[PDB]
Design a protein around this nucleic acid. Structure first.
Ligand SMILES: [Mg+2]
Ligand SMILES: [Zn+2]
Ligand SMILES: [Zn+2]
Ligand SMILES: [Zn+2]
Lengths: 99, 98, 49, 53, 53, 49, 53, 51, 53, 49, 49, 49, 18, 46
RNA sequence: UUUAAAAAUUUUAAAAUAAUU
């Protein structure tokens, strides 16, 4: 899925689009290798599925590399997901997959 | 060969338990599986694992190979303890064939 | 309300008979263990009535 | 994302762990094997989860 | 790309799978040998380039 | 919580349990060497007087 | 006029379907029996759902 | 040797060793694009096949 | 043992086809290697899957 | 030339059977359900309901 | 410490949870004695020393 | 297996399902009698042998 | 590091967590 | 208490993975192996 | 005297992916 990802002023897909289409992750966010199966659904349900299983580590990694704010979000606590996910190109792939 | 390979895989999945011995329990030599977070001594892998799991602040649980192994042992205990599974076989013996 | 009063009754009546071994232990085995442990203590017991 | 869950217990098996049901899904193929043997194959009809109109 | 990483570790079976590497893959060998013997002295190596037209 | 939650092992036999859980603390002989310390303490206080 | 419209509206607002890969498994009994909305240690005052929802 | 020197981070990422990230993904995709067929068959030449 | 294969044999025609096209060694190898599986097992269904891929 | 049975046998008299209730295995279920209803009845056993 | 080493009792605070989860109480109600005692009691085998 | 092949009897839990589905249960409750037996009436390792 | 259990927010001392 | 881990250690060295912290590393390897003087001090010592 | 069952309909017309006759 990388070799068919770039082509011509280029336009590239972030891997998050492919994860949105259904392909299951491997080692994101400092978790254990090979935790996710492909039976994770595709789209919003699949995204929620693979996020909720990691959310605590998902936020402690964010707080462990700089990303911190004084806003107790009900989901991610104090880490500022709004800046990092934009940085890590998560929103970009997630909204480019839908086009 | 594939026979030995699938056999080793089946053993690696199904042999998650030590044995089935009939004896009174014992702290020292009663197959007491000792934890480390606290000095308690449990008498089963699943018991020790529920021990370690209840250690860990249930709200902050995330996926882990430890959790995978926990669920696999819990799952295979039931299949091991089913009665039809206990008493059953595919190949005939000399006496049954007779 | 009547529902809440009945639920409180249910919780109390279910809490009064809870299959716990701790009282039976404290009656039957705990003093035996204390008496088996006492003679080997470095600092002997010092009690009053 | 406002909803949290809790992974409590491994459900009982829904098929024998010695019965081949699909070639290639065996103990060598660990995850599909575990999913198939703990969920069980499809033999029912449950179409249209809210296709009401 | 995929096979450069080598074998894998199974979180369920607790061991590296025994799948032979590329050095036991006779289709790749036949592919390379046919491409060699067709190319010969020529510098270009592909026996034909697939294109849109 | 400890007084409401309490359970024994599956089929414990208390004689065997204590027979093989009480052995080490009595194989360890160190309470005999404290009586000599008590002797020396009393001897010292009397000599001081 | 029958079949009050609190169900068609949600069915039209949300797009949640059974993915392709689950077609071979028994997801129906998993929905019915093995995803429990009453949490493990009883009520919570947060997981309570109103009668008309 | 060639493919390793090109995209070792990508090998580590998809093989369950190093955490995945978009930067390694896009750099690997660059490596895929800026890459020629002669490079392909040379990489095949690098493989020491057994008997 | 009573459920062993009882359909008519597939030997003469198979060897005829294998001989008409020079693929007699391959046919003999398959016909030999297949007669060593006498237990409905994961390994035998994997053998069939591999032979047919 | 005799075979014992742990339940009563009674030959049918129609080769096109339709349902009926008169047999010991249904009377047993009726008795069990009646006593289940009884032990659910009083508030002496299930007060919080 | 040596009482923990010797004693056969084992405090598993899931008895309380399993007995409180069987309580019957409505949902259109702003109080719940089961949840209240589970919060006040907090069964956790962290420190039963 | 011989009895199963000779018997004109079939088994299907849909009968139990349809019988249970007619009782009215409250949506705002914590205990569902019809939905509990339907859960615990599915055999393990799905064998009806 | 000490983490909450209601929103997963992470802190750095037990009094802060409390 | 509900401790967490942060940052430094990463060496799985049984399956060559890298973790998020040395505490997580310790728990991970443990899972591998499991599945598969003041006078008051003087008086106290006394 | 308070609670609650809520509807399981279709064959859903077209456009893309995959499997087949
Ligand atoms: Mg045709
Ligand atoms: Zn412990
Ligand atoms: Zn918090
Ligand atoms: Zn590891």
């Amino acid at each position: 899925c990388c070799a068919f990802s770039r082509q011509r002023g280029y336009l590239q897909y972030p891997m998050w689009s492919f994860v949105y289409w259904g392909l299951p992750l491997v080692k994101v966010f400092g978790s254990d290798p090979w935790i996710f199966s492909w039976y994770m659904p595709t789209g919003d349900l699949g995204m929620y599925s693979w996020i909720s299983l990691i959310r605590p580590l998902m936020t402690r990694w964010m707080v462990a590399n700089g990303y911190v704010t004084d806003k107790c979000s009900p989901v991610f606590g104090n880490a500022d997901y709004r800046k990092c996910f934009n940085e890590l190109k998560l929103y970009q792939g997630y909204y480019m997959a839908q086009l | 060969p594939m026979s030995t390979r699938i056999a080793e895989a089946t053993s690696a999945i199904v042999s998650k338990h030590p044995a089935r011995v009939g004896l009174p329990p014992t702290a020292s030599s009663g197959h007491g599986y000792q934890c480390h977070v606290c000095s308690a001594v449990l008498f089963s892998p699943l018991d020790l694992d529920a021990h370690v799991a209840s250690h860990g602040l249930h709200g902050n649980m995330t996926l882990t190979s430890s959790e995978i192994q926990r669920h696999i042992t819990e799952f295979i205990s039931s299949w091991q303890n089913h009665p039809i599974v206990q008493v059953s076989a595919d190949v005939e013996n000399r006496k049954t064939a007779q | 309300t009547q529902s809440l009063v009945s639920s409180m009754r249910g919780t109390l009546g279910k809490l009064k008979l809870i299959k716990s071994m701790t009282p039976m232990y404290l009656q039957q085995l705990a003093p035996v263990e204390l008496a088996v442990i006492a003679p080997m203590l470095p600092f002997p017991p010092f009690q009053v009535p | 994302l406002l909803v949290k869950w809790r992974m409590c217990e491994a459900r009982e098996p829904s098929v024998d762990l010695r019965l081949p049901l699909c070639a290639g899904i065996d103990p060598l193929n660990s995850d599909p094997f575990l999913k198939m043997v703990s969920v069980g194959p499809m033999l029912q009809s449950t179409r249209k989860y809210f296709a009401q109109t | 790309v995929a096979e450069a990483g080598g074998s894998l570790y199974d979180p369920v079976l607790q061991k590296y799978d025994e799948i032979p590497g590329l050095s036991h893959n006779c289709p790749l060998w036949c592919f390379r040998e046919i491409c060699r013997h067709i190319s010969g002295p020529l510098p270009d190596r592909a026996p034909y380039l697939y294109l849109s037209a | 919580v400890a007084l409401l939650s309490g359970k024994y092992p599956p089929d414990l036999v208390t004689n065997v349990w204590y027979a093989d859980a009480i052995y080490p603390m009595y194989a360890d002989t160190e309470v005999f060497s404290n009586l000599q310390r008590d002797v020396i303490t009393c001897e010292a206080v009397q000599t001081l007087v | 006029m029958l079949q009050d419209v609190n169900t068609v509206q949600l069915a039209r607002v949300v797009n949640l379907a059974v993915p392709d890969t689950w077609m071979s498994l028994d997801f129906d009994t998993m929905f019915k029996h093995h995803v429990k909305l009453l949490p493990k240690d009883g009520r919570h005052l947060n997981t309570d759902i109103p009668p008309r929802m | 040797s060639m493919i390793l020197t090109q995209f070792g981070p990508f090998i580590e990422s998809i093989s369950g060793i190093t955490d995945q990230s978009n930067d390694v993904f896009e750099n690997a995709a660059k490596a895929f694009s800026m890459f020629t067929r002669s490079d392909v068959y040379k990489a095949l030449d690098e493989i020491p096949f057994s008997e | 043992t009573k459920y062993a294969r009882s359909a008519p044999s597939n030997d003469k025609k198979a060897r005829e086809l294998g001989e008409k096209y020079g693929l007699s060694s391959v046919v003999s190898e398959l016909r030999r290697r297949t007669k060593t599986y006498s237990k409905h097992d994961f390994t035998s269904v994997r053998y069939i899957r591999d032979a047919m891929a | 030339e005799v075979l014992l049975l742990p339940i009563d046998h009674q030959p049918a008299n129609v080769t096109t059977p339709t349902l009926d209730f008169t047999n010991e295995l249904t009377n047993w279920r009726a008795r069990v359900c009646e006593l289940m209803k009884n032990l659910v009845d009083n508030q002496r056993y299930q007060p919080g309901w | 410490v040596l009482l923990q080493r010797i004693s056969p009792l084992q405090i598993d605070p899931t008895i309380i949870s399993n007995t409180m989860s069987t309580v019957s109480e409505s949902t259109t109600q702003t109080l719940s004695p089961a949840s209240s005692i589970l919060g006040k009691l907090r069964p956790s085998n962290s420190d039963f020393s």
